[PDB]
Structures are given as structure tokens and as C-alpha cells.
DNA sequence: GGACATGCCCGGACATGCCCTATATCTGACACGTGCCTGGAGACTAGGGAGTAATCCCCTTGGCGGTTAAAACGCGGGGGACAGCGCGTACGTGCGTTTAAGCGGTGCTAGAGCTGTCTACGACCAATTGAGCGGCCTCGGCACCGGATTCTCAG
DNA sequence: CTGAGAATCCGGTGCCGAGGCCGCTCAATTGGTCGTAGACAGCTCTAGCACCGCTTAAACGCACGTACGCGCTGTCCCCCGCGTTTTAACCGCCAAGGGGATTACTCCCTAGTCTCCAGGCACGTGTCAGATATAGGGCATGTCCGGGCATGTCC
């Protein structure tokens, strides 16, 4: 049957998700992860809805920006595929690693 | 079809090119070619002359094949064939199968192929050089449905692919052009050429 | 009946001044309030530090102006200083 | 009758509220009369600039109401605003539709 | 006690995040590093948020605590209070 | 037909050329030739003189053959023949088969061929050097349908191909001219000549 | 005789003599130590002030200072500093 | 009148409780300041000074130097993960950088 | 003027060496000069702004220390 | 033939030498002339304290050394050794200075 | 033929009359009737409605026959038939013999007769009474050559004779009309009507 | 077909009449009836409500049959059926044979007949007296080809004949209306109504 | 041969397909009204912080000279950047499955938030004085020089 | 393996800046008072957590093909490293002046308090724009036919 060329659908998805504003991380697993990490900081914590939404907005913005920088570093090396070493370089140059 | 025929222009060793007559765009001219669009506009069952030009003469046994495919990529795998109505009507010339879109007129040595592997229809004739004075060989095609026929081309544009082959069917050269089969070739040609500016 | 603090009516008046045909959503209003409060805190803090560094105990217009020049980009700083100066001069005359 | 300093100044942000927020922010023991006027005036100016650009972006999007997306477009498209808000994340703002040239097809 | 919730951050979610960041192709090995990075972010942000919560004599992390934590980490977030 | 006869002019070793009388264009003229068009205009069954000119005399046993083909390329493979009406009417001269378009008048040694391989009709006579005192040999052809005959030429123009051949049928020379068989040769010749300026 | 200029030089030297009785200090290095101490001072006092403001608190206490230290200082450093501060404050209160 | 003794001595600290208290009062941080806040602050500042000076002394002796110079302070700060984190955005004048060569730059046999 | 040439090629090489690079392209030097110049424009702007607010005519070391601090890189050793 | 080290040995030697010490590497007076030149483009007839220029110089060298560290790391990431302008531009872009 | 069919109008016991539609004289109307001339003008193979009117209903088994004869007395004995071209072309509807001029369309019970004694062609259908709520019965004829067809009617006018017959062929009634089969019925009808004044 | 179904209106013992909705003549109109023309204009495969009115209730077992015939007399004997394209497309509702033009929608007791003797298609449902609140029973027909379908109705107008019949198919009543199946019913209805004045 | 006789072709224009767009219906969230109350405005007061003027001195600017180390320039070469090519494998794309995320309703109770009270606690102020800073002096750590030792590199 | 170039180390000499001591002064301490703010109790009522159920869209596992990362090879160019020339950076030394810090006097500018009143903020409410489907409205493109030309015919 019909099959799209490698790259067209990836670009279509990039345009699609950069045009819109809905959150891309699932609510319930993000909340579960946040709560799991929290048990080791303070017991039986309760979290407001707007607090979990705040953590999710911050996390998605941070990851999107990090992926932007990672993509720029990969393309700089005449590559297209992002590597773990790309993430590590981006975070080291940003100064958190 | 399991495959899609290549449409890449390939003049090959013999410098194979197509040529077309200079018919104008009177409303109902029977067959008219648009250089701007590389597109033939023609009426159903009417004569469509296509000139074969070569820089040098291919060997005896060389054949010329014509095949239609849909131009739009999502339709490319669909075999181009006649609509159910024209398939059934009684217009066969005694040589062409009823479901073949493209016929050659005026050639007793015409062969019609229904490819067992690709399911593609095609029509093939022996290549004949021109006389030493003349400069090209003309083949006369007939298209046996309108582009608009429902259950057939259903308003989808097609390409005609013309290939020059040796006696085994190996590729010697290839050219192609778009085709619109319609009631008013001159009207429709001028409309599409005008829309180029839009 | 818990009174809060927002600039909603003033933002709406400025918007109607610049574009008296456009509305604003709740999320957008929240973003505008966050923005204005953030700027306010930044400018007031820089002015406070400026005053302390210079052994000044009063918040006056010169530290505000200098802080604006430090924080705002070129054209933004120039236009803001011009508008602030004209407005303060008109008020001072009006008393 | 009572007439406010903003009214005498022809400005929209409230001189009294900015003054009170300065007085209660534990910033200095005294505050001059002109300082909150200047600060309020700068805030009007910046608000007018941001709402101007966001309205423009909304009209380009055939929208009559500004949304966070339009605010993000306004801040990131303007060179000086992006600098001023270089370390600021606007929620539901998204990113600019920017594609690197080397990644485009040949 | 929630256990192994890190597996809830799925591969397609990270792929979508990369798409929004402009990434066209993603190695299979990307995911564990991304997960680690995400985890690191959470341990720092939540630590500050909970610290504020405990100072305020509260047991519920508020939106303002998180926004303030983000601000003091330089990643100021707009939309949940100033 | 499986093939198309060559129409290339070939004067050959003997300097073979055609000549025609200088008849004018009275609408009623029986046979008139147009140098501008290289086209004969003639009435059905009327005498059409064609002169054979040679620079030197071909050997005894040399023959002269005439064959018609359609001029338009898409009709070239269709055998030129009489229409069903004229085929059936009782006008045979005792020598010519009823379906042959072209006859030779006044020659007992005329032969009519229906080619088994090409299906083409032709009429052949022995070549005779000119009578002493003459510079050319004249052959008298008759055309037995109008160009307009329905079910026959059906308004399609034809060429007459005249070949000089040896006793085995090998080509010695070739010439050709267009033919219109019509009711008013003079009228139609002037019309087509005028249209040359259009 | 110039104006009174305050510094931590004598206190840095006393701590140094506690931890390294036979080690000295250069003027450039002492200046670096003073810059360091002043920077930390500014960070801690500012964060504590902001913490107190956020909670509608008008008094500077030891809880905001300790929490600010925990925010700014890394893990084991925070634990040791908190332990030292609590012991020191309880001993002072005993007096 | 009772003999005058300072709060720093009462707390077993070297940094001046009175001076830190005055700087808190005059730093425009709040109208009111508790008695224990400057004690706590002095204790944290003294602790950080003692650890940085300890590490700088170690580096100085490793270099056979008896006087602390900025180089030793920079080495001490950068050689400690927690101090390096705390001072991630601080440049020490006359401090230099840590000796470090990436493996890819070393020669190969 | 021409004074940008006073930060000579060997000076950029030495700074780069302390940055740990082993080889330096010929196109590096102008780039470094541009980066350095931009940095200076931003720093000196802030320093002079502070100097003018204090109603002074000479930029002091403390002016520079405040400029560097607000630029996001605190400099130790020059007061404060 | 006179002695000559292969490319790199002397480079490493200067790296070790300048990473061991802390004395300034950029010339004082040309930098001073540059700073005063750049400054008149903001305010004419400006003066500079000596310790102000030394502070600016210390800051500049620390900034350049850090930028060159990051540039080197980016070059090594690309399996390269020689740094080029695009490396500088990537380092500054990722840092958020562009 | 050995004989000539009578053409005398005979309404007979059932008051048999013909009627025709009021179609105007548009140049190329498919079928138009002239009351002035009692003449139908129609195109080849096109529908020609003829109405059968009766005063009272003929018995079951009554048939309606149509036959053409040449109108001019000297041609009357010549059987009217299709020309050689149309006779040979492939247009039979599966019911009508190829040489019959006159066909009935849309009637499965049509019979075509080639009279063994007279050699005349004719086409016959069963007479169907009009629905008791109707006035006439319409039969639809097709004429399969032009009046001008060479080798056929060859420009000679014909009459169509319509006879009402019993089961056995016994004359119940007779009517007739002239027919011109031509390319432009409206043009030709107006011309002949004008010429009536000349 | 060997025969033609009667189209005579016959209200019969039960006073059988048809009724239609008052739909106007706009764009996006799927079914509209013209009282002036007694003609339904509808879109392909859209719901066409036809009301059955009776003065008194027919016995249980009474059925309602619908059949199409060509309106023009020369086409009357040709069975009305779907064109080759729609016949082949995959749109059967599981109940109707693919070649039937007329379907009834929303009736499990629908029967489709292909008459062995006449070859006519028809669709029949049990008659049900009107629902509480109505003086008529509504049947919903679908027409599954456009009047213009080539190889099908081919632009020829049809009549729908609605017959009220008994169990043994005996006639209790008959009514009919003209139908045009088309893309723009409102447009086409207004056009034909306007032309009534021409 | 001129005047028709008579078929054929096709541009005009209608028949009649199909998409194409702009006009008709919901929803909760945003835009406006109201009441109130509390925070902002007018007025008067003190007092102290800031403006201004004179002074002094130090510390910034400018100049001269030398001299030497560093910058500039030339040139050889080698090794590293970079382009091309092959391959194989890891990732993109699609499809069927399943899994859990999402949404809607419902509970309840933990805990945020507000109010009242009062007492501990920090601002404030005067007297004291002793801790801390500026200045002066000195000596020892470090820096500069030179020469032998060791390391390290490349041929 | 070895020679040569660079770095390291070891010792001697000097020098200048860090450490210590002393005078002084002003800023921290102590003692007392008073307002106020926040710690605690108590009541409210909001919303966060927990659960159930249904749906469906997203995740997941896998098949497959192929594009890209990566390794290898060749090339050439351009940067390193070293020798030679130049130049200007630096150190020292001196002169001047100007502006930065200091002090004293004054005055006006803002906190503080009181009194009042109007603006801004909960509470309430209604209606308008988002999606879909129906009404215009364009194209999309086949068939018929009147006009005008082509071509036969003949007294």
C-alpha cells in the first residue's frame, strides 16, 4: 500500500505540536512520579491540583528547551539523530552538569 | 499494483524524445498539446498523434510501449483502466481488450499486455524508423474514457509513459506527458494555462 | 469576601486605550498579572539596592530612572524614560 | 470631592496602589512622591507595548481575543522584549515555529 | 508507598517533547538519560517546594510554593501566581 | 495493412521524373494538375494523363506501378479501396477488379495486384520508351471513386505513388503526387490554392 | 585617619587560628574571604527577608534564617550548619 | 554594673554578633529582627569560613606554602563538590583554573 | 579606532590556552575580539550608569564590581 | 638538523604552564586604551580608576577562559580538536548569550 | 418487384387515420412533419413517431405494417432498400435485417418480412389499443439511410405506406406520407414549403 | 420488456391518492416536489417521502408497490435499472439487489422483485394504515442513480408508478409521478417550472 | 457554370455535475453591574535626610626614557579538517492489541484560612566602654636569580 | 637509546607586605519601657484524596525497510613551531590638577496620624463566539445543435 517517506511525518508532527498548546506529558503518571519522589523528602504530602499542573508546565518547558539545545548541538556536528552525549553536552554547557 | 512504473525521463543511447503537433486551443480541437504544462488535452476515442524522435536509429526489434498511471502519489498504485460503462459498451476495434484505456489506431502489429505481476495494462507496437528524408515517427493513440468517467479515472489526472524497448523488453529510453481526456480540449487547456498565473 | 490584589481593571483600561476591540482570557489575565508583578519586583528591588549602595534612605525618581535604564533594552529604555519624565513633569506642574 | 494622582497625571495604573506596595515591601524607610508615579508610568508603557504586539499577533491569527500563544509570539518575536524576558517561561505559550535550514529536505 | 513510577514517563511522551523541541530523530538510548535528567529536576524543585511548605507550617504543597521555588532556581514560571 | 509504402522521391539511376499537362481551372475541367500543391484534381472515371520522364532508358522488362495511400499519417495503414457502392456498381472494364481505385485505361498488358502480404492494391504496366519524336511516356489513369465517397476514401486526401521497378519488382525509381477526385476539379483546385495564402 | 571601614579581617583570622594555628593569610586572600562572607550574608539575609514577606511575617526570627540556609547550602553542609546553629542558639538562650 | 561580655563570646563564636545584628537591622530587610537570627547567621558564616580555610590550608601545605594565596582558595573551592555547587557562579581573582586535560587530547602510542 | 588590534594574536592564543584548547583556527581571533568587545559594551554601560547615578565623573572599581555582580558573574577581590 | 618538536608537544607544554599559574595573560595598556575608547561611545571625557581597569581585565580573562573551556568541550564532542568560529557561536548560543 | 403496392388512402371500417407531432422547423430537428406537403422530414436512425388514430377498436390480432416505395412512377417497381455502405455497417439492433430501410424501435414483437413474391421489405407490429383513458397509439420508426444515399435511395423521394391488417394480412385500412431522410430536416422542410410558392 | 406497465391514475374503491411534502426550491434541498409538473426532484440515495392517502382502509395483506418506467414512449419498453458504475459500487443496504433503482428505506418487510415475465424491477412493502396523528401513511424511497447516469437512465426522464395491490398482486389503485434524480433539486425544479412559461 | 442540393463539423451555450464557502446553533467563561469596606486622598505636624558650598588631598592623568620581553612576520611541514564511500544497524512508520489516562459523580475529612486574645519580644533611647580600625614598625615568607638535576620528547 | 630542550628543585639574598602593638572613638552592650505581632485556640468550609465506571485514545509490541551514524581512506591546506626583526608594554620617576571624600549649615520632603470617602474587589449574571451543518454560490466539465462550410449535381 502507501507509505510515507522517512522524515515527512516527523516534520508534520513537529509542526503540529509546535502550533498548538496542549500538554504532552500524561497527568496521572507525572503526578505519580512526583508523589513517589516526594515520599523520600517528606511523608504523606498532599498536593494541590494547580501545584501538579505547575510542575508539569515547568517540566515540559524545561525538556522542550533542552531538546532544542540538544538538536542545535547535534546539527552543529553535521548530524540529525540526537545522542546521549548530545544531552550531556547541552547540560554541561548550560552549566547544570 | 504491487509496484509503480518509473516516470523518469531517460533519453538513453538513442536520444529518444517526444514531439507533438501545434494544434491551437479552439474550444473543441480534437487533440492539443500544452508545452507549458507538458500535457495533452484530447477527446475520447479521437486520434492523438505522438511523435517519436531519436538522434540515432535503434535496432530492428525495438518496440514502443505506452502505459498510463495516476499522477497523484496516493493513486499511483491503482491500475488505470476503463470505467464500467465504457468497458461494457460495444466499441472494441477487434484488436483492443475492452478494459484498456489506451489504444493504438492503424497498426496491425499492435499488442495489448495485461501484466501478470504488476497488473498494469499497456499497448506496444514495433518501432519503425522514418524514411531517410523524414525526421520522426508518429504513433496514433486513442484514449477510451474521459478523465471524468465515474468508476474509472474519476477526475484524477494521469500520465502517459512512453518507453522504447529492445526485443526482450529491456529499457532503451523513456518519456512521459500528462493527459486530460475531456469534451472540450481547447477550453480546458486555456483554463489550466490561465490558472498557472493564479 | 476575601479581598485580593490584582491590576485587572487597569490592564483592561490600557487594553481598551490601545485596542478597544480585543478581550482577554483568564489564563491570559493570569499571565499578565504574573508579568506585571515580576517586573514590579525586579525594578523595585534594583532601585532599593541602588539606593542602599549610595547611602540613600529615600526612594526617589532618579534611582527609579537609573534602574529602568539598567533593566530595559535600548529603545524600551529610551521610550520609558521619555514617557516617565513627561508624566512626572505634568504631575508636578499639576501638583 | 476626592481626585487621585493618576487622574491628575493622565495615567491608568493606580499611583496609590503602587505607592502602598512600595511602602510595604520593606524596600526603604522613605519613598519620594515621584517614584511611584514614574514606576506606574513605566508599567503602563510596557503593558501597552505588550498588548499592542499581542493584539497584532491575534489579528494575524484571525483571533479577536488574545490568548497565551499570542503573548508568547509577541514576546519572542520582538528582539527587545525577548531580551527583557530572556529567562521567563510563559505557560501555554509554546515555542516559535522555527526550523533549522539544514534539516529541510533537499 | 508508590514504587517504580518512573516507568510512567513513556517513550512516546519523551518523543513528543523532542518533537516540540525540534528533534527529528531520536535514538533508543535517549530515554534513560532523559528520565534521569527529569528526575534530577524533580528532586531539586520538590526539595525547595517542600522546604517552603514546612517553613510555613503546612502539610500541603501550594502552587505559590512551587512558583517561588522555580523563580529562585531562575526558571520563573508565569500563570500560577506572582 | 501491416506496412506503409515509402513515398520518398527517388529519381534513381535513370533520372525518373513525372510530368503533367497544363490544363487550366475551368470548374468543369476533367483533370488539372497544381504545381503549387503537387496535386492532381480530377473527375471520377475520367482520363488522367501522367507523363514518365527519364534521363536514360531503363531495360526491357521494366514496369511502372501505381498505388494509392492515405496522406494523413493516422490513416496511412488503411488500404485505399473503392466504396461499397462503386464496388458493387457495374462499371468494370473487363480488366480491372471492382474494388480497385486506380485503373489504367487503354493498355491490354495491364495487371492488377492484390498483395498477399500487405493487402495493398496496385496497377502495373510494362514501361515503354517514348514513341519516336516524343520525350516522355504517358500513362492514362482513371480514379474510380470520389475523394468524398462515404465508406471509401470518406473525404481523406490520398497520394498516388508511381514506382519504376525491375522485372523482380525491385525499386528503380519513385515519385508521387496528391490526388483529389471530385465533381469540380477547377473550382476545388482554385479554392485550395487560394487557401495557401490563408 | 580615614573614615570607619568595617571588615571581618580579625574574625577570619581568629577562625583561621582555631582551625590552622600555624597558617597565615595574604591581603588578596583576605579580601577574597571578605567578598565571600559578604556575598553569603547578602544571599542569606535577602532570602530570609523574602521568605518572611511571602508568609506575611513582620519579624525576623531564626526559622526563616535556618530554612534559607537549607535552601542555599548543599545537603551535608546544610545539616552541619543547622546543627551548629541550633546548639549555638540554645546555648545562648541558656544565658 | 555587670562586666561587659559580648554575645559572640556567649555563643562560642568568633564572628561579631553585634555587627551582624546591626547589618541586618540596617540592611532594609525588615523592621524587626530576632535575637537568635544573627547568632544562627554568624554560626553558618563561621562554619563555611572554617571549611574553606581548612581546604585552602590543605592545598597550601600540598604546595609547601604556609601562606594562603588566592590560588589556594580557588583550588579549595573547585576541589569540593558542595562548595563548587554553592559558588558555581563565582570567579576568584588570581585563582586560575583547575588543571584538567580531556582524554582525547593526550598523545597516543 | 585601531585599538582593538592591541589585543594581539598571541594574547588570544594565551587566553585560549588557559581555556584548554590545543589548536586555534585563523578565523578564531576576530570572533574572540567581537565577543570580548560585546561583553565590554554591556559591562561598561552598566558601570558608567552606576557612576553617573552617583554624580561622579570617574568609574570606580566598585562600579565595576556592581556591574559584574548584576551581569550574573560575581567578582571577588576588589571590595564589597 | 636542528631539533623540532612534533605538533602538539609544545602546545601541551604551554597549556600546563599557563594552567599552573595565575598571572595575567592579556596586556594591560592596550586593553586600557580599548576600554577608554569604547567608553567614550557612552560618555565622553570619562576617567577610570586603576583598580577598575584591573577588575575589568580579571573579569575579561576569566570570561574568555570559561568560554574557551566550553568551546573546547563542544569541539571534542564533534570528534574535532581545532576550534572554529561556529564552535564559539554554538557555545554562546547554548549558554543563552545569543 | 413484380408489383406496386397500392397507396390509396382507405380509412376503412375502423376510421383509420395517421397523426404526427407538431415539431417545428429548427434546422436540425430530429423529426418534423409538414401538413402542407404530407411529408415527414427526419434524420437517419432517429425516432420518428407516427400516431395511429381509429374511430373504433380493431379486433385482437390486428397488425400494423410499414413499407416504403419510390414516389416517382418510373421508380415504383424498384424495391426500396438500404445502400451498400449502410447495409454493411454494424448498426443492426439485433432484430432488424441489415438491408431493411424501415425499423420499429422499442418493440420486442416486431417482425421483418422479405416478401417471397413481391420482394418488398416491410416491418409489422401488433396493433395495441390506446389505454381506455387515451386517444391514439404511437409507433416509433427509424429510417436507416438518407434519401441521398448513393446506391440506395439515391436522392429519390419515397412514400411510407402504413397498413392496418388483420391477423392474416387482410386490408383493414391504409394511409401514407412522403419521407425525406436528411441531415437538416428543419432547413429542408422550410425550403420545400417555400418552393410551393414558386 | 415484453410489455409496458399501465400508468393510468386509478383511485379505485379505497380512494387512493398520493401526497408530498411542501419542501421549497433552495440549495441543500434533498427532495422537493413540483405540483405544477407532478414531478419529484431528489438527490441520489436521499430520503424521498411519499404519502399514501385513502378514503377508506384497504384489507390486511394489501401491499404497496413502486416501479419506474421511462416517460418517453420510445424508451418505455426499456427496463429502468442502475448504471454499470452504481450497480458495481458497494452501497447495498443488505436488503436491496445492486441493480434496483428504487429502494425503500427503514422497512424490514421490504421485498424486491425481478419479474420473470416482464423483466421489470419493483419494490413492495405491506400497506399499513396511517399512524395516530396522521391522515396518511408515508413511505420513504431512495433513488440510487442520477437521471444523468451514463449507461443507465442516461438523462431520460422516468415515472414512478405507485400501485396499491392485494396479496395476489391484483389492482386496487394506481398513481404516478415524474422523477428527476439530480445534484441540485431546487435549482432544477425552478428551471423546469420557469420553462413552462417558455 | 452558376445556382443549388445536401452532408459534415464545431463553437456557442446550455445541461447539470461537484466542490466551496458563508451562514445557522451551544457553553462556560469572560465582560458588566452592585454593594461595601477598607485602603487611598487631603491636611497638618515634626524632624532628619538630602542638597549645597567650601576644603583638602590623593589618586588619576599625562609625559620621558630605556629595555627587554613580547608581538609581528616568514616559512616549512605534518597532521588534522573535510569530502567521499561503504555498510549495517538502529530508528522511523504502520498496524493490531491492550492498557490506563481522562472525565464525570460523589464523600468526606484533613487542613487552609480567618478571627480573637494576649503575652513575649523586639524597637527605641540614654550612658558606658571596650571592641575594632587606622597608623606605624618590623621581620620572615615569598620572590627573584642561577645553577645543577630530573623529566620528557623525538629522532 | 640518547641528546637536547624544558621544567623542577635547591640554595642564597633581598624586600615589602603581613602580623603585631598602640591610640582612639563610636558602636555594641546593658538596663528599662512600651507597643505590637505572632503563637495558640477555635471555628469554618474548601478542596484534595479516594473510589467507581465507562470510553477511547494513547501506549506498546512487533515487522520491515532504509537512512544515517560511523568507520575508513585520501587529500590538501592551514595552523604550529621556530628563527628573526620590531615595537611597545612595563617600570620607574615626576608633576599637576581635579574630583572624591568630608564636614557644616539649612530647608524641604516624607513618615506619621487623623478624617473621610470613593474605588476596587467578592458575588452575581448573562450572553457571545466555536463547531457543525444548511443556504448560497461558485467552478467542473459533458452534450446538443445552428451556423457555416464542403462538395455533389445539372438543366
Author numbering:
A (entry chain A): 38 to 134
B (entry chain N), F (entry chain K), K (entry chain L), L (entry chain M): 94 to 291
C (entry chain H): 28 to 122
D (entry chain G): 13 to 118
E (entry chain B): 21 to 102
G (entry chain D): 27 to 121
H (entry chain C): 11 to 119
I (entry chain F): 23 to 102
Reproduce the article's own wording on this structure.
The p53 protein is the product of a tumor suppressor gene, and functions as a transcription factor that induces the expression of genes related to cell cycle, apoptosis, senescence, and DNA repair. The p53 tumor suppressor is a pioneer transcription factor, and binds to the nucleosomal p53BS DNA when it is located near the nucleosomal edge.
To determine whether the full-length p53 (p53 FL) targets the nucleosomal p53BS DNA by the same mechanism as the p53 DBD, we purified the p53 FL protein and prepared the p53 FL-nucleosome complex. In this experiment, we employed a 169 bp DNA sequence, which lacks one linker DNA region without the p53BS DNA, to avoid the non-specific DNA binding of p53 FL to the linker DNA. Interestingly, the p53 DBD region, which specifically binds to the entry/exit region of the nucleosomal DNA, was clearly visualized as a tetramer, although the p53 N-terminal region (TAD1, TAD2, and PRR), and C-terminal region (TD and CTD) were not observed in the cryo-EM maps, probably due to their flexible nature and/or multiple conformations. In both the p53 FL-nucleosome and p53 DBD-nucleosome structures, the p53 DBD may contact the nucleosomal histone H3 tail near the His39 residue. In addition to the p53BS DNA region, the hydroxyl radical hypersensitive sites around the nucleosomal dyad are also protected by the p53 FL binding.
